[PDB]
Design a protein around this ligand. Structure first.
Ligand code: DC
Ligand code: MN
Ligand code: MN
Ligand code: MN
Length: 688
DNA sequence: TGAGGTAGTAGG
DNA sequence: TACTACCTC
């Protein structure tokens, strides 16, 4: 049982390697010509070319000087140039002595399986870094899709083609997506057309026939022991034919990479008592902060004409929700203004939505709206009911909203199977039977997810963290880019235990792709004033979480926040680090992954936070970086892990911590004009 | 869109 | 960043 990482560190140092350096008065074509003529791995940066071996054929270009030298480790220019040379030499050593082809951003290896005109290829990606005078090489394994035939098969052998189809030109190095017959095709609107014997059709999931996406998906889900044993079996074959660097016989363990192993424990949640599991008291507990909710029902008549479900069947569903809500300490009352709008939400109302939507505002104000729109009307690209509802109900008038035919049909199929078809509204001793049949099966999670989405949008806190963290205030920041527009993702967590989780009441529209200084200052000041409002005292420490890389002004975070004599940390959280971690079991020769595992090396860490099943895939590690050093890094990791269990919006555990997950959701929603600011002191998460 | 997690694809 | 498939609860 040893901890394994998909990285290695070379025995040689950055200063133990001698290289040849040429400097010329950008210079891509010189390197290209030298590489073509000499058949040797070269690398270039700005106006300097570096290699491991001298160039024989000079290609008529004169440098100022030639050096057979060691690099200068105190400069970043010669550490960036060298990191590309090992990569290029490894690619060179992969193309020869191994049948690999540099396609896109990866190295296609070989065909593993063909599924009815669909070919799957294995591919690998390599990364080189220079850290602390050590050369680190990381590697990742992926797949690639291709179609067997080309435009010839759609011209010859019958068949035909139609305009708008996406085609792929793959000339080896990189591919573009757009002599018997010439077919025009354009994506950049620049005229181009040529032979239809090498343009293939695109192989994405969306443009793929059924019975394939069901079998092309079982050939990319390698559980834990076939994604890892196959990644190592190729690097260990590339090693045997690489001469410029040397490694240990087993360079994949974390000890060879200088990592430290930490095993975090499962937190506890508090609501009227201490519960070990988040899903342990939702069945048998009382919510931490209850209250009163006035719900509304928006019923569509297309839900009846096309699907044999009567409006009354909506109210024997709500009555099941309320009977569950009276337990846990929540009061739901149906608004009385919905009786004057009977027979109004017809099909023409969805075709004509913008013109006749204002008059709905008075009858839905100060309530929570439950929409029962059809799946088609939400998914259709003409009606676009979901986007309009989000943009009007929440984005304009600030009312929370939360069901298609699949849910109701599954509920009624369950009811019919159990044989209960009598009245289940305003009838005790029978709603309990419906609740019992709902339990012991998987629709209970659907019911509780709906209930939790209603609660968190109504201002109810379902639970907090039983124990206390090492920080006081948590701030989550995120940026979303779409169609040349950027949206910020401010998010506030007040209390060490996670007492009050809300969204910063700030205008998240950004002129640029980064947060302005004034916005950051206002965010910090409002965070301080909101923690003071609830706890009557100023916070002692604050930990800022940033999704991605910290690009803001670090010198300004302290300029205002020192003035309050409060300590702070800045943390970067990276999703998709393009690495994997495992626990190899020598006795059984099988890989596995354990939740709450940390690999630590200085101010950087890899964390495992999820436990997916065999058929879903393999867990994705998270990367944690600490820009500051005010607090121990272990206490930084512990807070990131514990904060991930505060998924009060849903009932299924999420991977990222609460701040950044809700920051991403808030940025996505507020990019689309679906959320508007609301000052207050309650748990407000409308975007979910 | 009940909720979430993983894996592919495209552009920046 | 965005999209699409699947499985799990
Ligand atoms: N493969 C990727 C990864 C990130 N991105 C986006 C997400 C961010 O807006 C930005 C990268 O930011 P960061 O590397 O700090 O996470 O580019 C992308 O467009 N393609
Ligand atoms: Mn981001
Ligand atoms: Mn995001
Ligand atoms: Mn939701």
């Amino acid at each position: 049982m040893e901890a394994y990482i998909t990285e290695m560190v070379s025995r040689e140092r950055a200063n133990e390697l001698e290289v040849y350096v040429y400097v010329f008065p950008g210079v891509y074509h010189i390197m290209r010509a030298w590489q073509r003529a000499n058949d040797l791995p070269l690398a270039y940066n700005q106006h300097t070319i570096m290699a491991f071996s001298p160039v024989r054929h000079m290609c008529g270009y004169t440098p100022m000087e030639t050096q057979k030298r060691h690099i200068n480790i105190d400069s970043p220019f010669e550490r960036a140039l060298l990191e590309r040379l090992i990569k290029n030499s490894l690619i060179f050593t992969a193309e020869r002595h191994l049948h690999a082809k540099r396609v896109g951003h990866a190295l296609r290896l070989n065909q593993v399986q063909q599924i009815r005109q669909v070919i799957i290829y294995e591919a690998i990606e390599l990364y080189v870094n220079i850290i602390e005078n050590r050369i680190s090489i990381g590697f990742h394994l992926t797949h690639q899709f291709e179609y067997v035939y080309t435009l010839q098969s759609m011209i010859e052998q019958g068949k035909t083609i139609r305009p708008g189809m996406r085609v792929v030109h793959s000339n080896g190095r990189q591919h573009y997506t757009y002599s018997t017959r010439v077919i025009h095709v354009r994506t950049k609107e620049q005229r181009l057309s040529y032979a239809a014997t090498l343009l293939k059709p695109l192989c994405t999931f969306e443009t793929m026939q059924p019975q394939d996406v069901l079998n092309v998906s079982k050939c990319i889900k390698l559980s834990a022991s076939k994604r890892m044993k196959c990644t190592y079996r190729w690097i260990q074959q590339l090693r045997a034919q690489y001469r410029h660097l040397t490694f240990a016989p087993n360079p994949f363990t974390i000890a060879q990479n200088g990592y430290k192993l930490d095993q975090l424990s499962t937190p506890k949640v508090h609501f009227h008592r201490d519960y070990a599991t988040v899903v342990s008291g939702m069945k048998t507990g009382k919510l931490y902060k209850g209250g009163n909710i006035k719900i509304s029902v928006l019923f569509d008549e297309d839900f009846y004409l096309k699907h044999h479900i009567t409006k009354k069947d909506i109210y024997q569903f709500i009555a099941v929700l309320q009977k569950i809500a009276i337990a846990q300490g929540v009061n739901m009352t149906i608004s009385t203004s919905t009786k004057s709008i009977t027979g109004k939400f017809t099909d023409d109302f969805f075709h004509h939505f913008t013109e006749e939507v204002e008059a709905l505002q008075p009858i839905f104000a100060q309530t929570t709206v439950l929409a029962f729109i059809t799946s088609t009307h939400l998914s259709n690209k003409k009606t676009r009911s979901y986007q309009l509802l989000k943009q009007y109900f929440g984005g304009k008038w600030d009312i929370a909203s939360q069901i298609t035919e699949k849910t109701i049909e599954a509920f009624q199929k369950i009811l019919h199977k159990h044989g209960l078809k009598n009245f289940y509204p305003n009838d005790e001793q029978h709603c309990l039977r419906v609740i019992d049949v709902l339990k012991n099966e998987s629709f209970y999670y659907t019911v509780m997810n709906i209930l939790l989405g209603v609660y968190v949008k109504s201002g109810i806190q379902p639970w907090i963290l039983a124990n206390t963290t090492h920080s006081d205030c948590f701030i989550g920041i995120d940026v979303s880019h779409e169609n040349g527009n950027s949206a910020a993702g401010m998010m506030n967590v007040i209390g060490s235990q996670g007492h009050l989780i809300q969204q910063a009441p700030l205008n998240g529209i950004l002129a640029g792709e980064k947060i302005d200084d004034t916005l950051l200052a206002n965010l910090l000041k409002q965070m301080i004033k909101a923690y003071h409002t609830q706890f009557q005292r100023f916070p002692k420490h604050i930990t800022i979480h940033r999704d991605g890389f910290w690009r803001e002004h670090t010198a300004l975070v302290e300029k205002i926040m020192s003035h309050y004599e409060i300590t702070y940390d800045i943390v970067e959280i990276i999703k998709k680090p393009n690495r994997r971690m495992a626990f190899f079991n020598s006795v059984d020769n099988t890989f596995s992954t354990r939740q709450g595992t940390v690999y630590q090396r200085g101010n950087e860490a890899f964390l495992c936070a999820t436990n997916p099943q065999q058929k879903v895939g393999m867990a994705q590690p998270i990367k944690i970086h600490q820009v500051t050093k005010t607090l121990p890094f272990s206490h930084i990791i512990e807070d990131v892990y514990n904060l991930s269990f505060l998924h009060i919006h849903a009932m299924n555990k999420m991977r990222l911590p609460a701040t950044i997950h809700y920051a991403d959701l808030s940025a996505t929603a507020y990019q689309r004009g679906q959320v508007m600011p609301r000052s207050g002191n309650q748990t407000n998460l409308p975007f979910v």
